[PDB]
């Protein structure tokens, strides 16, 4: 026999049994251990010494000798998951005795007096008590129905040795059916102090509800309620994928849902599977699939699960490759007819997993896992600081909001990284400057958080889609005519896609923009992503162009089945006259495919009622005339430089910071002279001119109007004639 | 497989004897498998199934003596079936990859067992493999798997009879689903394999449970049952994995939506119907086919929707293949493809071959070219017309600029016949519109439908669609839904849009027929 | 160092926990090592070095044992230091090559033994590469390994402090050299690594002894002490090696030189 290392059990029948001290190990194993099973026992986990001392009995020899039962409670207690292996040693010195003992009762508002009527006796009366962690049912007390729990960990006992993990006490009662000095004292969480692990919970999670729901569901229904959808016949799913970039918290999201289910749950280490005689990985996946499968509720968790199976195109090196692929999902396709059971497999990159593994039979669930959004990241902070309380910090809401928008390009993984550095620079900050002053007075500040996000460096900058900043429409200067076109243009498809289907008409899905790169455009784009509040993808020209061959391919094909199951949205192209002008620019084949690729997706045996389709460009003609066909991009807006009244509106926001009455600046005679020049030509002048009036006096409350003439003098128009009447030409031949 | 098996002796009467290997292919999910398992629970006799990966060792004898051990069961036991599973795997091509150790020393084994098992028996081997093209040329050779299964794409008609079957095994108790709602669903799917139909039905029970569990308040399922709303939602997000194929079939459309000109309908269906009833014809007078017809006209319309109708009246299975789609960046293949398809059209009876574009791939010489494409030409050059000749098939080619088929191509004897195919006339405008606005009251707007044609004589059946759909957006956008389009609108969709045909190109156009 | 390990019951309080990774990484001469030295020599903890291949071993699981045996022992000792040297060929990049072996599986399980040995406890982890860019993104993640410094190569100011220090530890008594000499010399010494200012020395202790031997047989070589002359022998004859760089710090120039 010689058994090193077990595998958890719930402890079943319920009621009160002994509930502490279970621990129903083979008689075998009693002996081999040289220890009377009237004594204590010790489980491991792979490490933390201390080892869970814990009393020991004997079971009826039917509990094999793999599985070890020791109670829900030390398994919350301990977070011991099911499928760990856990280490049996001698037991440890009987501690003395225990000093205060106190009650918490967690996720209660406590004072409840009438309704305890002497839990102590409840509490006291199991043998063994770990004092530190223990958590119980509610059970049945008076009326008033209910659930608590109560948390134990207050306490004034030392242990001399500190090897123990949780150092137990002993127990001494005075009653039937006194403590010592009273137990009941404040609600208080879980002492940090006692460094116990934390139990992984869905309130930790923020900005991953949408599919967080979705996967609870997916989880519950073959688990608990496979009856329902045996009765169909249709079978349930074995598997689920999770993909997303990395840093989404793939492995916690993993980690919560283990700790949230009760049933059987089994996890693998990865790659350290592989080994040598190609015969020990297929015997360890199988007995894996065995003890699955052994116990009717199970779980199986799979992690990067791209190099335990890679695409089998993409290489060939050998050893565990696609041989493993075959016997898994042969052991996966008929493994059982109803059961529950749920395979859950997390990989980085859903196209490097080998398309066998995508496949229906398999896969067919798919969950995306996105970059968090300003909605996501702001909960993703308060949530934190929520937890954090505000013992530790002074940040209010509005504070946390405008972080949040701050912060565009990062991950979940970047904005812990990004707290943790931050308390360093508030301890550095603290510390180097007021000689080792007390920590709770300065505690976090915006300022340091503000230079802790200069220095974080992030480097999930590179991103297949961006979320362009949102700017409203108060601060738009623009012509009311190309607003009120385009807010017709994102009304129609939204509300009247039923309108269409009864008529016939459907959607262009094609709105073609070009004009002076001066302005207007990327603004226009940027009223329509705020205004409606609709899903919005930035896309640039120079972006998607991949020195590889085939790469954009993948990521143009990415990028619109994204917008296709997103929801409807809008694409939106920054600049589109790179990709359109290859007979011109003598561009290369890949270009050619691009735009081929492109115009089947847009107008090719499909159709993509729900997304809408817009482009800007600054050279028009330089486009293809295949672009320009109708039915594809037949609007055409021409936006070009803005009027009198756009650059009144941009010069009196510009100039807000400044005061106009004491220059005495009539915000008229300025925008009568500037006619020729562009929202940014205007954002140009002015900051010369601001830098001007601030390099003649250091520091000043407004802005002079011989600044803004020099500034005039000494800038240039910038716009030609000829472009605006070629873009005239242009529109008049379209 | 009941050729061998129940008369062995009628078949070994002939002294040819009876085939023992049949071999089945096609893309993944088609249900190879099925037919596997159905031929192993329909059949009385033994059968031996392989575990593929699990018979490979690290001992080179292992594997030959455990298929030494397998051959030996089924020929003791008189009655024996083989099935092989993923028989590329087992079997790679020695040309494409030299793995080494378990390798085509398997494959000679085999196929020294498998020559001379027996003489007459009654013995027969199923191997199912998911590309034909990387299993080795030894084992595709007419001496062991010459009888050959093709399983290809369901079409309209298999994915209906596959979703009434599908939704009988549910029954009706389970989902309320009729005949029209099925065949909106299989018109809908065009191209999804089996495998993805049968998922979808899945995922679509799922969205049934969550959106009972989310607004009945865990209700019984029963009741809620299964509609069309899901099933939506379904076609949504099932994230097909069989858009890419050579295989892809336009949906049936009828005479009365095309409006054009019945002189290049006469032609057409005098083209179309020579061969099918002609072939005796031909054979008697020697003539044979011209098998080429080539469309070349505006970017406008009346050349490729007439393709779609084309199929639809002559209930012929097209292949409707892309021009640009066969371009791959892997060199040799576009030739790997294009290979594959006229196979596929010689051994899917009498069929017409369309092309989308030819305007691309044909020039070589006018504009620059990689080799490739050169080759890929040449390669189509010598398909065509160059030492083998088609008589079944009829291959049409459409493209939207002539110049650029070079001479080699356009050469007599092949693609002889040449369509102006034009802009649509007035007549054909005039039942485009007609058709545009049968939806509208052309009776409210108090229009006849002959002055806006009239009008609307240099634009094209797709431009004419366009205004009719830009009218019905400015008749629409003013008070939400309207129970009419205005002239007004009309006529102002005419300034808002520009044909953007040019006389010069027509005149080309002209220019080219005449030389032809 | 400090932060983590000295009070680790203050930053437990906020419950953030501290980091478990710093990393060094710049062209050699950058005294990566000297730094753990230094910090070991200094520090009166615990400290647990590797020596690299050695750990590595044919078999698939020795590596792994021999990996949490030495992470419990030092989880064991409350002070502990962990040294990680050439942690880039420990962790070659999985994208650059699959050579397998030594590869991504110990590199999971080095993370998650150094991501959960405890709640806040004082345990630091250091790792040295040679080149940050070799190294596999999967250790170069905020997660893990967040906490990194940067080392260059010495400026004119560092150089001259280098070079200041090193003529130190000989003293006067062997050798009387002003701070002058020593700033030329900072000046002159532009592309050198911080090995190769001892590169230089010891080059010039050499060019002195065979010269004082070849020139007086053999006399006492306090007489002789160290020279300038020497320094600009060792210089020329040195043959420079990190010329190339990223970054140049071209030679200071003030206005007075300016004519404009
Ligand atoms: N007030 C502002 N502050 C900062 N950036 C701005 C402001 N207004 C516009 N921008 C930026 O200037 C860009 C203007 O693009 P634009 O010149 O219209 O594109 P195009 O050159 O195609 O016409 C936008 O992308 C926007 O991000
Ligand atoms: N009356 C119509 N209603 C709707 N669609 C049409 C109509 N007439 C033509 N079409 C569509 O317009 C397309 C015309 O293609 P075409 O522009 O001639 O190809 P190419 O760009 O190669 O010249 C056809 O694919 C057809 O589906």
């Not at 006992?157 to 404040?186: A, C, E, R, W």
């Not at 007390?438 to 999930?460: C, H, N, Y």
Request: proline letters at 5%; aromatic letters at 6%; glycine letters at 8%.
């Amino acid at each position: 026999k010689l058994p090193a290392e077990f595998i958890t059990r719930p402890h079943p029948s319920k009621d009160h049994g002994k509930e502490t001290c279970t621990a129903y190990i083979h008689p075998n194993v009693l002996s081999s251990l040289e220890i009377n099973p009237g004594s204590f026992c010790t489980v491991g986990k792979i490490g933390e010494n201390g080892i869970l001392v814990i009393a020991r009995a004997g079971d009826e020899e039917v509990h094999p000798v793999n599985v070890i039962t020791l109670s829900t409670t030390i398994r919350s207690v301990g977070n011991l998951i099911l499928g760990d292996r856990l280490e049996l040693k001698k037991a440890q010195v009987q501690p003395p005795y225990a000093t205060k003992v106190t009650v918490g009762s967690l996720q209660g508002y406590n004072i409840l007096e009438c309704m305890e009527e002497k839990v102590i006796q409840k509490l006291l009366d199991d043998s063994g008590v770990i004092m530190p962690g223990m958590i119980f049912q509610n059970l049945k007390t008076k009326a008033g129905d209910e659930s608590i729990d109560v948390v134990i960990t207050d306490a004034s006992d030392d242990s001399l040795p500190d090897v123990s993990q949780l150092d137990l006490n002993m127990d001494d009662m005075y009653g039937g059916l006194g403590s010592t000095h009273i137990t009941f004292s404040k609600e208080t969480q879980a002492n940090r102090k006692y460094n116990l692990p934390e139990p992984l919970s869905y309130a930790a999670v923020g900005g991953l509800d949408k599919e967080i729901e979705s996967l609870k569901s997916a989880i519950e229904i073959p688990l608990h309620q496979p009856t329902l959808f045996s009765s169909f016949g249709v079978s349930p799913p074995r598997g689920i994928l999770l993909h997303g970039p990395p840093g989404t918290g793939k492995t916690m999201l993993l980690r919560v849902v283990a700790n949230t289910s009760n049933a059987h749950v089994l996890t693998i280490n990865g790659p350290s599977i592989v080994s040598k005689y190609l015969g020990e990985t297929e015997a360890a996946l199988r007995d894996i699939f065995n003890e699955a499968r052994k116990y009717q509720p199970s779980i199986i968790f799979i992690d990067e699960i791209d190099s335990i199976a890679p695409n089998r195109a993409n290489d060939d090196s050998g050893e565990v490759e696609s041989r493993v692929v075959a016997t898994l999902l042969t052991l996966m396709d008929g493994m059982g007819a109803a059961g529950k059971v749920v395979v859950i497999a997390a990989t980085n990159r859903p196209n490097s997993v080998d398309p066998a593994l995508r496949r229906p039979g398999r896969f067919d669930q798919e969950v995306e896992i996105g970059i968090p959004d300003v909605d996501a990241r702001f909960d993703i902070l308060t949530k934190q600081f929520s937890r954090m309380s505000s013992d530790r910090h002074v940040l209010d809401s509005e504070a946390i909001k405008y972080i949040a928008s701050k912060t565009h390009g990062y991950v979940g993984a970047d904005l812990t990284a990004l707290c943790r550095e931050s308390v360093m620079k508030t301890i550095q900050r603290g510390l180097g400057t007021d000689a080792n002053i007390d920590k709770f007075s300065l505690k976090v500040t915006l300022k340091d958080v503000e230079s802790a996000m200069v220095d974080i460096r992030p480097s999930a900058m590179r991103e297949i889609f961006l979320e362009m900043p949102k700017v409203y429409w108060s601060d738009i200067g623009g012509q009311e005519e190309l607003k009120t076109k385009m807010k017709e243009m994102i009304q129609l498809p939204l509300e009247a896609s039923e309108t269409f289907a009864r008529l016939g008409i459907s959607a262009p899905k094609g709105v073609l923009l070009y004009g002076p790169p001066g302005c207007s455009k990327t603004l226009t784009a940027k009223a329509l992503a705020t205004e409606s509040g609709i899903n919005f993808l930035a896309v640039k020209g120079p972006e998607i162009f991949n020195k590889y061959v085939g790469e954009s391919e993948r990521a143009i094909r990415e990028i619109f089945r994204k917008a296709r199951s997103a929801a409807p949205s809008i694409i939106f192209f920054d600049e589109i006259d790179a990709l359109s002008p290859d007979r011109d620019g003598s561009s290369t084949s890949a270009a050619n495919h691009v735009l081929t690729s492109l115009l089947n997706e847009i107008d090719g045996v499909e159709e993509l009622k729900g997304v809408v389709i817009v482009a800007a460009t600054n050279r028009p003609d330089e486009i293809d005339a295949a672009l320009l066909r109708p039915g594809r991009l037949d609007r055409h807006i021409y936006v070009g430089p803005p009027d009198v009244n756009a650059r009144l509106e941009i010069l009196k926001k510009c100039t807000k910071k400044f005061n106009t009455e004491e220059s005495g600046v009539d915000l008229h005679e300025l925008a009568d002279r500037t006619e020729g020049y562009s929202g940014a030509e205007v954002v140009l002048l002015c900051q010369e001119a601001g830098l001007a009036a601030i390099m003649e006096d250091l520091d000043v409350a407004k802005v002079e109007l011989r600044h803004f003439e020099k500034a005039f003098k000494g800038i240039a128009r910038g716009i030609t004639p000829e472009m605006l009447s070629y873009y005239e030409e242009f529109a008049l031949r379209s």
